[PDB]
From a paper:
At the parasite–host interface, F. hepatica calcium-binding proteins (FhCaBPs) have a unique EF-hand/DLC-like domain fusion found only in trematodes. A unique family of proteins called calcium-binding protein (CaBPs) or tegumental allergen-like (TALs) proteins are abundant in trematodes. These proteins have a dynein light chain (DLC)-like domain at the C-terminal and a calmodulin-like domain with an EF-hand motif at the N-terminal. Among the F. hepatica paralogs, FhCaBP4 is notable because unlike other proteins in this group, it exhibits calcium-dependent dimerization and increases hydrophobic surface exposure upon calcium ion binding.
We successfully determined the crystal structure of the apo form at 1.93 Å resolution. The asymmetric unit contained two FhCaBP4 molecules forming a homodimer with a two-fold axis. Each FhCaBP4 monomer consists of an N-terminal calmodulin-like domain (residues 4–90) connected via a 10-residue flexible hinge to a C-terminal dynein light chain (DLC)-like domain (residues 101–190). The α1 to α4 helices form classical EF-hand motifs, where two helix–loop–helix structures are connected by two short antiparallel β-sheets (β1 and β2) that flank the Ca2+-binding loops. The DLC-like domain adopts a compact β-sandwich fold composed of antiparallel β-strands (β3, β5, β6, β4) capped by an α6/α7 helical hairpin.Sequence conservation analysis revealed that the EF-hand motifs are genetically conserved, whereas the flexible linker region is not, suggesting that this region may confer species-specific flexibility and functional diversity. Five residues (W163 to S167) of each protomer in the extended loop interact with five residues (Q’154 to V’157) of the neighboring protomer in the β4-strand through a pair of hydrogen bonds. Superposition with the FhCaBP2 DLC-like domain model (5XF0) yielded an RMSD of 1.45 Å over 88 Cα atoms in PyMOL and 1.0 Å with a Z-score of 16.1 for 87 Cα atoms in DALI, highlighting strong conservation within the FhCaBP family. However, a key deviation was found in the flexible loop between β4 and β5 (residues Phe166 to Phe171), which displayed significant conformational variability despite the conserved sequence. The elevated number of interactions in FhCaBP4, particularly those involving Glu12 and Glu78 located in helices α1 and α5, respectively, indicates that the calmodulin-like domain contributes to stabilizing the flexible loop within the DLC-like domain. The calmodulin-like domain exhibited an RMSD of 3.5 Å (79 Cα atoms, DALI Z-score 7.6), whereas the DLC-like domain remained structurally stable (RMSD 0.5 Å, 90 Cα atoms, DALI Z-score 20.0).
Numbering used by the authors:
A (entry chain B), B (entry chain A): 4 to 190
Amino acid sequence: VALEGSNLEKMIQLFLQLDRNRDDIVDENELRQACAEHKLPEEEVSRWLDMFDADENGKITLEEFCRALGLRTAEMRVEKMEREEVRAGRGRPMPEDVEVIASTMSQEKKVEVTEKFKEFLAKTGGKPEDMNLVVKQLKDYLDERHGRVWQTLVLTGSYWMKFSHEPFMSLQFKVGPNIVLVWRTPS
Amino acid sequence: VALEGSNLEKMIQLFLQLDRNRDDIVDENELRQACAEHKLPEEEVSRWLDMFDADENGKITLEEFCRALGLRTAEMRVEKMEREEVRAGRGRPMPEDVEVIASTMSQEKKVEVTEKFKEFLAKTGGKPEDMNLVVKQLKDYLDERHGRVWQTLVLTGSYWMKFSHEPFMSLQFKVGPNIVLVWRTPS
């Protein structure tokens, strides 16, 4: 069923769907064909394929794929399973009063981030002077548990945003009057 | 005139001010002296200064400095020129109605960015259905003319932010009811 995100994220999702835990190896041609059948630009995919060092059989290991794209293989193993989980029917609710605006995160990670924001907010009382502390605590949690470096914002009122982030690392949500925007970038 | 920004940004500004020869050569002892005069902490300066492969003649070239620090050499050449203009009393005024909240951008880039936001906004009518297009135009302009990748936000209301940006590449400003946040992250 449906597949979502930027072109690079869709290629990564398709690689993870073809990948099998037993060997973590994906056929280059099968990856290209799946990208074609999901309408990705031909030039872009061919340019990505040239970045991957395939073996003599034309197979890309998950490690080589992540290395070439600046991804963390251990993290992509977890993403693979957390996405399979929801496709298999084992989805979870979001925590109470969480409204997701947009996201590229796996569902488990969405629960993790929104529950930590609610926990940090509950300890400070949610006044504007306490919001700097909440933002710093949420950024610290994200930087440590999910790698550096995270852009972290809380705002009230209306907003419009065009932004760039590492694959699957972005989430925009609302709890009451607070809008929370988090995403990861390199370094 | 006064240094601004992070310790790393201040050390880079000092490097560019010291670089006053045709070969882009800076004397490492002179750089340390400037950092000491500007009360930059020794622990951080020493960590950065060890990232450079000084020639054993105690000299660092702009190119070596930029490579060790993850800066684009051509951008730093232009940054030096723009900052010196301001030091010389020859900077541009900010355009009408622009209130700068925080920035480590050079003055000429601050003028260009806030000017471009006003022009993109003036060609739409300023309505909320049109602001997604304003933000997209600004981000695309910045990505192309000043390198990838730019984060771009327009907001009405209040905000709290912890974020990370490349040296000199961040600007927050207000024009009328709109607060505009822009900054660049790697890649």
